[PDB]
Design a protein around this ligand. Structure first.
Ligand SMILES: CCC1(CCBr)C(=O)NC(=O)NC1=O
Ligand SMILES: [Cl-]
Ligand SMILES: [Cl-]
Ligand SMILES: [Cl-]
Ligand SMILES: [Cl-]
Ligand SMILES: [Cl-]
Lengths: 311, 311, 311, 311, 311
């Protein structure tokens, strides 16, 4: 119950491996995801080395309390993982093979700028703090890094589960810390968004544009203002459940643009009626006739500019 | 507290069994359900063998700490089950009969394509990782697999609770994994859905069609747009509380179809009034008269096509 | 420790008793309630019997670990109760007086058919599984079954806390199980419903009926459709927070009836205007005049039929 | 680890004290509040008495496991408090001074009848169960009862933290129990309720009264019904998030009164138009003219009557 | 397991240091934030001092149970922190280098008066209570006080993590308490508020002002009342999820001002129409013409006055 002694000066290499069993509860708003996986750890301790000819065992199994085990922690977790040691095996040369099954709520930030067409990289940071007698450094056993085929996140396409092999070694509170990066690449399943959000939101906007084929100010006010209410009501219905994002998103820009179009269409309706009442029906009619083409064209162009700037 | 030694290299057979006591909290959105049940386990540990004559007892009872117990875990669980060992009984041959009462939040995916007429198969995967000394394989004791008659999920008809007897044995991180599939088949109780969701949503749509028995553009705009508001408001009220499904559902298709019908009815109302104002009341009136038949017929037809494509 | 040995063939009788300290968190939607109470247990274990003269003590206190204690569990709980043993006392004849203070989330179904005029019976099922050496049977002492006077559930009148004295002994997985039914009878405090939900809901409906004292189709469309919106908006405001009930409720029937009345009133308004425009103002006016009496009378009758069928 | 012995058949007096460190999470709907405080306990155990001369120390410090400590529990708590023993000190006469720092979610009912002008008394009930060897009685060390000056509840003025010195001793499950009442008096500081809820809710109602200065039935229907929608919509926005209170509140009475006024104003608008259309414009105009004074006067008076009946 | 005996009058100095690893879950409404960090503690216990020649070791490692460790607690936490001792190291002179990794939900009040342009100072109060034998005083080494570069709070700019070096030593329950103030300075990311909340809410208000370029009372009622509905609906959509603040905020003042403007615009519309109908179209037209300038000018001025009073 002291770290293994160094054969030559060099630090202890703790070989790691994460194997995803289950991925669930991806909360976009909280920027957290819950994960259930295996953590494999391999290190050599020659104090645990033995001759198989005299000892007469394949490998010696130990209790966690019995031997020295490195303290591997996660950087980006809410609280410490719920871990359960599955097996500890010691080969004759002193190579300890540790395996545990853990569940953790991982805090990983998400970029919503290209939502719902976005893709994300979920991070899991492994960390080990070096001891007095010797430095501890992390490594990746690529054979022991993977994911269950059945691993699923509803609404996401799980691309890959890989690790950045070279650790980030640095000093923290007068000790060396070796940090590893396990990445889960996911891409969103944006299909339903079109018939479910895009298309009914666009219909409401189009209904407001019928005020360009009418001269009735009462019918026109009822058209643009009632559709503005239906727009807001629709947005309450299809609300992300996510408190507003501090940065400007593609989706956010378009919604802003739609509120601007409701305001501009009211201006038009207001102008047209005032010109008609102010004995100028030539200007009133030409503005209305222009708007019939102007409104959809400006909308289509501004939308293309936005789609281009974001993607 | 090491696995029982093999006589002739044979793997240890752990006879399982799950008996549902309570099933509750089925969260459609989270694709999770909470379960309270019995887990029965039986295996032979000859190290515990005794002679009932010298012992004076025909069976021996042990504390979990006292003997070796296989590490049975569930694959699709949020965290490890809250288990409480009920009884451990050893017969003279050294056959252990283990029983525990556990509670677990099981992650099982759900297909909402045929909602609310859907049926689901809930899975519970039992798993055991083999040891260095010997391999461990799972088995189903069919006499120990069942459910309490009083087991209920509000709004579901619990068809059956069975297990796929042949385990899925496979290699993972250089060891054998014997996995079992326990299945809970449930079918939805969709009656209340007709008077609560379907009919009041259909009435609102029908109200919009009264604009085909009017020539008043002000009354017509008020009809189609106010009903569209009422539709959205109704949907906010009867909202599933489920963030939108990534795939297209039967329900989703119909709602989309309804939003399209609100838009088409506005087009009609817009066309009719423009023709009237453009000195063509013959065409205006014939379009309106056609819509009176067209709208319900196309709706009934498109609905049958949708019902066919989904079921 | 193993169970106490019997002279009398009859199994071991464990005298139970539950005393409610606090009742809180009654979730109508989840059909769960949280409870904090005392669990009293009594049984004779002659192995513990002593001579108070030679022992020098009239009563002996033991640690739960020290003696044999029956495994009492609850059938309808989310997870096993958080229990804390308060006292264990042994009398010279070997009688054990066990007492613990527990907290549990109890799953008890609720029938909303007569909501908000309903009354409910909350169940707590005590269970004990028989050992191999001897069978174990539960008993109630209704002196030991009670509740704190200050026990409260907001919006409910806590009638009684009692137990069904005859236990339900039955075989499960080749062993006997003696089950007790503890019942908490509660009745709803429905006063607030009239001034909060029922009267404002009736007012909106009556507003729609003023369309029978008008000939203005624009004012009439605005009356029936705007009130339908206000009805839905009201229902969003006074929403039960309960996902729709799979069965037909009294409340559910009436709400359905109200949506039907909104649709029928639109039909009337539509018919009246079409007859007027189709040079038939005699029929139009007689339909409107009839509706003035028909609508409230049919509403009052249909409501009485519903109230009768449900109560 | 047995209770201290009585010299002359006296019960053990446990001197208590609670010192509020933090008060937070007051949930009006759940009728719970979370508290972080110090619990001080003092009692005389002569088995711990010593001669400071021979001992060399004026005070002795012990580990909780080392000595006998009374089991103090809380009556109205969700689960048992998270406690941590800060210090245990023994003086030469054997007077024990125990101190712990605990956090608890206390269930204390709230009376909303005078909301938002209400004041509440939060209770914390201390309890001790007497033991076989001797009876245990609670006492208040008033020197050890207080609160941190920085203790705050957002939207409340924390008046006082005091205890009812005379304990409530009584029998429970054949043992005497001593109960103490700690009271936290709070008064609601919700000044912003006037500009945030009261004034916008009144403006909406006043807008409906403008239909008494109009003869246009279409404009009037649009005024009273649209404002009724805006009223409901406003109430959805400023919703307490508290499921309806079973009893009639001051706030509840006024909201009811407002819904009645919307209905009465519709009746007026309906009557006025019907009289006008039924060739009686003298009565129609006199009713409208009356309403202009009647409506605000009846509102102001009924409001005063309500304010008087509740306060 | 007694405090170390000093020769010097001065109390024991415990050098503290907090290092933020993760900051998450900042709940504006609850005025709480969750934190994951390192707690470093340094003190000298001469009883631990050793000859490293005789000992053979330059540093000694101890288990928390093995040695005396000061009881460091947090003042403003929900429950005591979930701590995990990372390392304990002793040098030949008796210096203890303690390090733990803790997670805590910190209660820190927030001032919303200047929201969404606000900045906040989050507090973490460290505290140590002095023992019988000697007083214990806290110290800050600002070298050890830091934060991970990757520490983030969505929508906030984390300015600095620091500590007020001079501890607040005071008497509590006849003992000394040394308290340290750790501060996290954050400033809000208000950009998205302009296009998401400010601008669309203004557009709706402006739409209501078009009622100053119309004489149609039906169109005007529809304008002012429908926009008031859209305003409320918008506020439901962009709702903070925060129950109203007991104090008057900048945002709160403006929203109140907007509701006043909706009411004043209704008064105008009502006055205009009544003057027109009361054969005075000169006054009606001059009031309308004035409002066109008055309304935006009064709005712009009142807004500047509010912005000045709050900032
Ligand atoms: C008040 C009635 C309603 C729909 C209610 Br959400 C409205 O708000 N505005 C309108 O212009 N028309 C309407 O029908
Ligand atoms: Cl961890
Ligand atoms: Cl498990
Ligand atoms: Cl239980
Ligand atoms: Cl407690
Ligand atoms: Cl703490």
């Amino acid at each position: 119950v002291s770290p293994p002694p160094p054969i030559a000066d060099e630090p202890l290499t703790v070989n790691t491996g994460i194997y995803l069993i289950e991925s669930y509860s991806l909360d976009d708003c909280a920027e957290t995801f819950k994960v259930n996986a295996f953590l494999s750890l391999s290190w050599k301790d020659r104090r645990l080395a033995f001759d198989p000819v005299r000892s007469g065992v394949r490998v010696k199994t130990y209790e966690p309390e019995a031997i020295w085990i490195p303290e591997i922690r996660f950087v980006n977790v809410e609280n410490a993982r719920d871990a359960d040691v599955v097996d500890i095996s010691v080969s004759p040369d002193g190579t300890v093979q540790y395996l545990e099954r853990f569940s953790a709520r991982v805090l990983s930030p998400l970029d919503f700028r290209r939502y719902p067409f976005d893709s994300q990289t979920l991070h899991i940071y492994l960390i080990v703090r070096s001891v007095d007698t010797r430095n501890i450094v992390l490594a990746v056993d690529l054979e022991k890094v993977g994911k269950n085929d059945d691993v699923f996140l509803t609404g996401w396409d799980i691309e890959s589960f890989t690790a950045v092999v070279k650790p980030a070694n640095f000093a923290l509170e007068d000790r060396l810390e070796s940090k590893l990066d396990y990445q889960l690449r996911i891409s969103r399943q944006y299909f339903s968004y079109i018939p479910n959000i895009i298309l009914p939101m666009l219909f409401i906007l189009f209904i407001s544009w019928t005020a360009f084929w009418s001269t009735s100010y009462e019918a026109n006010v009822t058209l643009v203002v009632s559709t503005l209410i239906a727009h807001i009501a629709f947005n309450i219905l299809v609300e992300t459940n996510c408190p507003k994002t501090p940065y400007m998103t593609y989706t956010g820009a378009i919604i802003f643009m739609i509120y601007l179009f409701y305001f501009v269409a009211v201006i038009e309706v207001t102008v047209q009626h005032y010109l008609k009442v102010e004995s100028q029906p030539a200007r009133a009619a030409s503005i209305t006739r222009a708007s019939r083409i102007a409104f959809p064209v400006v909308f289509l162009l501004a939308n293309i500019i936005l789609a281009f700037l974001f993607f």
